[PDB]
Amino acid sequence: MRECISIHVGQAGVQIGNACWELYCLEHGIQPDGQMPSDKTIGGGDDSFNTFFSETGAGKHVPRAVFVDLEPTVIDEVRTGTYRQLFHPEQLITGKEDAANNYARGHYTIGKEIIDLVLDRIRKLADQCTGLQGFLVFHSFGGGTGSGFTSLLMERLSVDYGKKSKLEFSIYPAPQVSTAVVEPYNSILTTHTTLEHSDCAFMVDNEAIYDICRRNLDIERPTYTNLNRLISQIVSSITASLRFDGALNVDLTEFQTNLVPYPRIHFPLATYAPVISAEKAYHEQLSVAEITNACFEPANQMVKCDPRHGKYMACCLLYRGDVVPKDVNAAIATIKTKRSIQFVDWCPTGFKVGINYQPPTVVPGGDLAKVQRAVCMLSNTTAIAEAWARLDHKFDLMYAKRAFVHWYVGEGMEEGEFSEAREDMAALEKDYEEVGVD
Amino acid sequence: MREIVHIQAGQCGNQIGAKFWEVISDEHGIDPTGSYHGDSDLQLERINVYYNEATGNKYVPRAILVDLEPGTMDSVRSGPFGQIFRPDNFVFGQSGAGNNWAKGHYTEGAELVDSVLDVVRKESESCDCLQGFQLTHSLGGGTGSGMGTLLISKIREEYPDRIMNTFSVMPSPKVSDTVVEPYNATLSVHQLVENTDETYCIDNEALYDICFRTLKLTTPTYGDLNHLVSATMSGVTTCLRFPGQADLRKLAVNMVPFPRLHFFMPGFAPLTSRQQYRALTVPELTQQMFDSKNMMAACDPRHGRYLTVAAIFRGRMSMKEVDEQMLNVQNKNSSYFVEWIPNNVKTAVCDIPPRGLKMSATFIGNSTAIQELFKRISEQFTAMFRRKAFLHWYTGEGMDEMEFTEAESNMNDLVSEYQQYQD
Amino acid sequence: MEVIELNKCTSGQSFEVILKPPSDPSLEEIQKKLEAAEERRKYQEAELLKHLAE
Amino acid sequence: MYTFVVRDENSSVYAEVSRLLLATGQWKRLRKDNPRFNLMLGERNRLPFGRLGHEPGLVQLVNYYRGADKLCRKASLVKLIKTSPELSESCTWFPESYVIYPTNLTDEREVFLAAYNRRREGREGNVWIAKSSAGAGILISSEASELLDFIDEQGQVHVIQKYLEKPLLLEPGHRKFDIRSWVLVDHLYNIYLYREGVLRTSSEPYNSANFQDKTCHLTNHCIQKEYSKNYGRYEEGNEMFFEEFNQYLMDALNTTLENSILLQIKHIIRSCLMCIEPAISTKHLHYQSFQLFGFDFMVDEELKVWLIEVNGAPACAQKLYAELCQGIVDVAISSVFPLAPTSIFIKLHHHH
Numbered sequence A: 001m002r003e004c005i006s007i008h009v010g011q012a013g014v015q016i017g018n019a020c021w022e023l024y025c026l027e028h029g030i031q032p033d034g035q036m037p038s039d040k041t042i043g044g045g046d047d048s049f050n051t052f053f054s055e056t057g058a059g060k061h062v063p064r065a066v067f068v069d070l071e072p073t074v075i076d077e078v079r080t081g082t083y084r085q086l087f088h089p090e091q092l093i094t095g096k097e098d099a100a101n102n103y104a105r106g107h108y109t110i111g112k113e114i115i116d117l118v119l120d121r122i123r124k125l126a127d128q129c130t131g132l133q134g135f136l137v138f139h140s141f142g143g144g145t146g147s148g149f150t151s152l153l154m155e156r157l158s159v160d161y162g163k164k165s166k167l168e169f170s171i172y173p174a175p176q177v178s179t180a181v182v183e184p185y186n187s188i189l190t191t192h193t194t195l196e197h198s199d200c201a202f203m204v205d206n207e208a209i210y211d212i213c214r215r216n217l218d219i220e221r222p223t224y225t226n227l228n229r230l231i232s233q234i235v236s237s238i239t240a241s242l243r244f245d246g247a248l249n250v251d252l253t254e255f256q257t258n259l260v261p262y263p264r265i266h267f268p269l270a271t272y273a274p275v276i277s278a279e280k281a282y283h284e285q286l287s288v289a290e291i292t293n294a295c296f297e298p299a300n301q302m303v304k305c306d307p308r309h310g311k312y313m314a315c316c317l318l319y320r321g322d323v324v325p326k327d328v329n330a331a332i333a334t335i336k337t338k339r340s341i342q343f344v345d346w347c348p349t350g351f352k353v354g355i356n357y358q359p360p361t362v363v364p365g366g367d368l369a370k371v372q373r374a375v376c377m378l379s380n381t382t383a384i385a386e387a388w389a390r391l392d393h394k395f396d397l398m399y400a401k402r403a404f405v406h407w408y409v410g411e412g413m414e415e416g417e418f419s420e421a422r423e424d425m426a427a428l429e430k431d432y433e434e435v436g437v438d
Numbered sequence B: 001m002r003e004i005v006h007i008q009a010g011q012c013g014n015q016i017g018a019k020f021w022e023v024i025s026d027e028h029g030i031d032p033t034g035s036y037h038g039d040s041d042l043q044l045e046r047i048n049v050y051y052n053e054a055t056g057n058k059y060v061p062r063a064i065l066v067d068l069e070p071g072t073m074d075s076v077r078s079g080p081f082g083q084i085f086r087p088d089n090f091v092f093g094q095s096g097a098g099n100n101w102a103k104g105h106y107t108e109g110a111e112l113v114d115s116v117l118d119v120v121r122k123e124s125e126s127c128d129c130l131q132g133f134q135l136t137h138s139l140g141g142g143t144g145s146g147m148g149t150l151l152i153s154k155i156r157e158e159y160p161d162r163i164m165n166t167f168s169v170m171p172s173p174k175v176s177d178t179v180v181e182p183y184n185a186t187l188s189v190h191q192l193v194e195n196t197d198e199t200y201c202i203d204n205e206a207l208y209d210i211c212f213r214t215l216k217l218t219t220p221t222y223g224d225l226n227h228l229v230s231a232t233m234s235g236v237t238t239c240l241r242f243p244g245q246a247d248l249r250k251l252a253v254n255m256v257p258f259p260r261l262h263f264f265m266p267g268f269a270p271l272t273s274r275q276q277y278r279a280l281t282v283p284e285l286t287q288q289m290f291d292s293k294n295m296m297a298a299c300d301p302r303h304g305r306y307l308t309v310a311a312i313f314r315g316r317m318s319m320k321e322v323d324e325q326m327l328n329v330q331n332k333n334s335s336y337f338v339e340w341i342p343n344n345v346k347t348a349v350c351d352i353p354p355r356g357l358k359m360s361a362t363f364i365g366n367s368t369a370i371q372e373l374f375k376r377i378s379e380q381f382t383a384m385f386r387r388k389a390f391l392h393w394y395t396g397e398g399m400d401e402m403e404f405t406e407a408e409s410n411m412n413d414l415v416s417e418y419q420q421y422q423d
Numbered sequence C: 001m002e003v004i005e006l007n008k009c010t011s012g013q014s015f016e017v018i019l020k021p022p023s024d025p026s027l028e029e030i031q032k033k034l035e036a037a038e039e040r041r042k043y044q045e046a047e048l049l050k051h052l053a054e
Numbered sequence D: 001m002y003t004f005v006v007r008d009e010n011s012s013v014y015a016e017v018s019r020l021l022l023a024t025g026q027w028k029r030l031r032k033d034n035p036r037f038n039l040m041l042g043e044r045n046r047l048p049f050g051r052l053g054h055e056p057g058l059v060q061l062v063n064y065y066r067g068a069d070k071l072c073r074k075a076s077l078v079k080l081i082k083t084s085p086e087l088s089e090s091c092t093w094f095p096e097s098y099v100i101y102p103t104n105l106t107d108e109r110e111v112f113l114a115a116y117n118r119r120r121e122g123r124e125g126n127v128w129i130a131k132s133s134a135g136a137g138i139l140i141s142s143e144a145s146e147l148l149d150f151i152d153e154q155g156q157v158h159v160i161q162k163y164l165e166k167p168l169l170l171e172p173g174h175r176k177f178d179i180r181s182w183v184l185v186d187h188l189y190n191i192y193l194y195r196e197g198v199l200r201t202s203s204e205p206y207n208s209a210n211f212q213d214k215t216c217h218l219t220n221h222c223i224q225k226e227y228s229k230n231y232g233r234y235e236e237g238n239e240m241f242f243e244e245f246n247q248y249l250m251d252a253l254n255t256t257l258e259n260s261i262l263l264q265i266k267h268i269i270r271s272c273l274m275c276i277e278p279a280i281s282t283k284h285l286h287y288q289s290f291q292l293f294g295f296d297f298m299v300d301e302e303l304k305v306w307l308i309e310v311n312g313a314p315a316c317a318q319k320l321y322a323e324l325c326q327g328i329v330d331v332a333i334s335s336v337f338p339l340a341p342t343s344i345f346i347k348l349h350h351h352h
């Protein structure tokens, strides 16, 4: 058994962590006070859920997580929230003034002061791991903390935990749920310094989660809670392998082996189905072929793009619920004959499938309906570069007039780090095109 | 605990600061004695941003009242909410400023500045974490202009990394006290260009036309003009005073694309005349809020281009209906917004409406049209400075003509800076 | 349409399907980049006070 | 008030649609870089599709189908017909074609020779034609040595296909020609055929004993108006419209354009567009697409229709710009952005 430490950075990271750890407890049957009746080994054990939870002599199951925010307003909810007894105070680190949506502020000005405190609070969790696998870092691109402080944390984790792996759960900036004009700057700044330090990153575009909530959940104006409850479903389906008995994606190392043949191109697209409104009278339960086929609809992709005009490098099917291998193959054959699936010529054309019999757990009073079977498809398509183009364009519109640059220069950062990061993104866009187009 | 220190300097500064506290004290449930009698927890949520909690659950406005003659501040202390202000926070002289920037900045004001700062340092030394300072003042007078900008220059020295916010009333010959208001304004504009992060420009001419034309007030008073400034200051500070997804620095990071271009045009809506009971829809709030006849800068935005725009909607309304209407004004007049700053228009909703209004909207624009403002001021300045008219009032206080020529060149540069970004 | 590595357990199963065959900075350099930015903040705030002293 | 942008100043078609949109007082034009637009008239090459469909509140429409290049490229169309089971290599309406990469760069060089030697052994007509997309550069010859040696002299991909040695000729004149039909596809993927086509005819008597002089073999509007010496003799601008051609078919062959030719043209369009629907449809996409096509056809002496190429950015005959463009606004633009007949098209229903 090997442990996984989760790190949540910035307001986005913390709230999404709130929605995920809320879900992990319901899935493993862990009460808010940290008690777990189903667990029979009191105060110890090397089970599958012990990769995310540690145990105390008092029978408490404590998440192996660290929350960090440069402003104490968002973490304070966790300290007095429903799950206040889950974590102990050392796991929740809070500053006094945030980064003002300024990457240079989160990375240099404020970061230097609190970086060592974080690492220490992390090293304390690491000292309980008999075989630490790596880290799951949740954050945003737009926030000055999620963007600026994360890249610094990754740089240090690669120093104090060399051989360990690190996965990301990034939030792509979307103007429909953001009041920050400089997030294109922060995104392209953080992706540049974090690239060589993240072995695999799952991007969730807030635009995509927004529409899935209005189109499928019939929510006219979605709240962060609606968005995070949905995002934690995907996160749960992506981490379930690490927390349940199985053979596919059993440790973090298996996420690069199965998803990232080339290093820099470590951004898998995700897709989830079904998303059914609980407020519905009652939905006709979808079959395996029907929910599988939906994995190739743009409507329920965590990033809005067009895989039909890219090339796949890898592909995983994570099913949860009443599914057997026979129905999976049956649905796959049907889809190849109708869909547009163009692979690269130096990767085999095939799918690794994983089936976990436990159906998706429904958050009491949430927005999602209880389904009998759901699937999450992790596919590494060059079609995701579209997201990088959009962002890279906006970065070009503002940087042409040096707009807003003074805010970053004023925190100690050099103006040349903009064009440097940008040229890196230009390189990352080229490496994507060298692999997909003919 | 992100606290803001308020400072009001001069006649105009104090009279406006007074109502601003009267207005927000009402919305936060604070009575003229500092006691809370509200009905919602939203009021006290972000209460410490502008109020200090004393003993017995007392809320004392974190504000400093500054003036060089007792007259105006005597009124506040005897006004409605006068008792709410901390007695020590009244720092005033006796010689007066004679509507002279030189006196407020170099001679009379210099004798009192060190004592006003001793109070500033007192309120800060209690703040768990100080966001920054906000100053209310006019630029055409002597104290709020000459001394106010002297305070800013000095606050930036003791607090070099805190936000310096101001509400600055620009002078207008149509609402003029003395002929030397252009002199005083040109001198202060240079201090603001250099030492403030955000300045809400408020042209008295705009306020007059709004009271005369839109509001249908036969003979406007400085009292009618201040009603607007109250409603406007209350709106722009909604982001800070109530729960919503915003501090002073974040506002500057998202509004000021260039250091020296940080002067904003506020706007309010509705602006009804006493047909005052008609319910106001969301389209109407938006069509008015962007209308030039509802702005306080006396600048035609169709003559310039917007760099960044913020809008706050107050009341129980449709947040889906707000989005649809904001996204409409942009797509119907995208020629007046710069195309090199993506999503440069943001919107924030608020559930607590101002006093006596079902729903309202406040407008914060960083438009290049504001150069037309600094143009008038620079015209009225040169018309007098080319003959050296009224210079003796200033050269007698110790100044020289060179310092006047430099402030002239300082603002003409500010105009050229707003011009290259309009193409 | 082959199926390989079929592994089954109480909590589920997993397998692989083949449709077609194929055809860092040290701790010294980080402290330097951080102290270099702080040095440029100290220099800037110096020119600010120098200007305020003038 | 709808807004649109213009990123292709060289397009003669959509330069008129822009003039018509502004003539409605309800469509405003914006700078070619302003992202707030309802309609895009994008560039030909490297059109940034990935940046469409991300502006909140705006329903954006583009005038090109992403991936349509698979059908509008010389080498792309060939590979699509021989690989798509919907068309098969035994497709009956497309001339036997092979993709040939120049020997300085898969490649069907040997498969071409196989079918070439088989024809040379069987006495059957063995006249081929070489061509490429980067041309303005065509060689008609009955020898495989000249065709292969000609492609090696270039540096881009070419294609060799069977030259119709028995093409239908018009009289008087004994001349060759081609047919151009225009097809508009809206966001819903309705396939509308413009009732009006044009015949770009040849003004030189067809000479099958001299493929060297390419004035009597090629029917390009620019070649006849440059290298031909009978330009504008029998018809105006080597352009015969469906009324005069449908009259000639009746006085000479005793048949109608609807039956002998149009039924075949309407079938080819269906089979081509139906084939690539599951790859370019914007039915569940965040933005919507619509594109105008121009198919070119050949007619042999047996009154069989052969497909030449498909143009994704085609031009139109001078006399038909007004009616067609307005039809674009009716069924392609106003069908998405309504304004405050006797359809000029012929809907080709199908199974989506």
Ligand SMILES: Nc1nc2c(ncn2[C@@H]2O[C@H](COP(=O)(O)OP(=O)(O)OP(=O)(O)O)[C@@H](O)[C@H]2O)c(=O)[nH]1
Pocket (backbone or CB within 6 Å): A009, A010, A011, A012, A013, A015, A016, A070, A071, A098, A099, A100, A101, A102, A106, A140, A141, A142, A143, A144, A145, A146, A147, A171, A172, A173, A174, A177, A178, A179, A180, A183, A206, A224, A227, A228, A231
């Ligand atoms: N999906 C999701 N996105 C969020 C959430 N909270 C913030 N965001 C996104 O994060 C972006 C801004 O980053 P923040 O996380 O708020 O910034 P931060 O990490 O707290 O850093 P600071 O600038 O110091 O506040 C915006 O584009 C939001 O859309 C959340 O709870 N869920």
Ligand SMILES: Nc1ncnc2c1ncn2[C@@H]1O[C@H](COP(=O)(O)OP(=O)(O)CP(=O)(O)O)[C@@H](O)[C@H]1O
Pocket (backbone or CB within 6 Å): D095, D129, D131, D135, D136, D161, D162, D163, D164, D165, D167, D176, D177, D178, D217, D218, D219, D220, D296, D298, D308, D309, D311
């Ligand atoms: N296999 C074949 N048999 C007979 N004629 C042929 C032929 N292939 C091409 N042609 C002639 O060549 C012309 C079409 O050339 P092609 O379309 O390949 O060049 P192009 O694309 O530059 C002209 P367009 O403007 O239609 O795009 C037709 O007029 C036709 O007469």
Ligand SMILES: Nc1nc2c(ncn2[C@@H]2O[C@H](COP(=O)(O)OP(=O)(O)O)[C@@H](O)[C@H]2O)c(=O)[nH]1
Pocket (backbone or CB within 6 Å): B009, B010, B011, B012, B013, B015, B016, B097, B098, B099, B100, B138, B139, B140, B141, B142, B143, B144, B145, B169, B170, B171, B172, B175, B176, B177, B181, B204, B207, B222, B223, B225, B226, B229
């Ligand atoms: N809006 C507004 N402007 C005022 C008010 N009182 C004075 N002014 C303006 O301020 C300028 C004079 O400045 P003043 O307040 O006397 O400055 P002081 O010397 O510091 O007291 C004139 O141009 C007036 O138009 C007021 O109550 N409201």
Ligand SMILES: [Ca+2]
Pocket (backbone or CB within 6 Å): A039, A040, A041, A042, A043, A044, A045, A055
């Ligand atoms: Ca146990």
Ligand SMILES: [Ca+2]
Pocket (backbone or CB within 6 Å): A158, A162, A196, A197, C024
């Ligand atoms: Ca590493």
Ligand SMILES: [Ca+2]
Pocket (backbone or CB within 6 Å): B095, B108, B111
């Ligand atoms: Ca004195």
Ligand SMILES: [Mg+2]
Pocket (backbone or CB within 6 Å): A010, A011, A071, A098, A143, A145
């Ligand atoms: Mg934050």
Ligand SMILES: [Mg+2]
Pocket (backbone or CB within 6 Å): B011, B012, B141
């Ligand atoms: Mg006065």
Ligand SMILES: [Mg+2]
Pocket (backbone or CB within 6 Å): D309, D310, D311
């Ligand atoms: Mg062509």
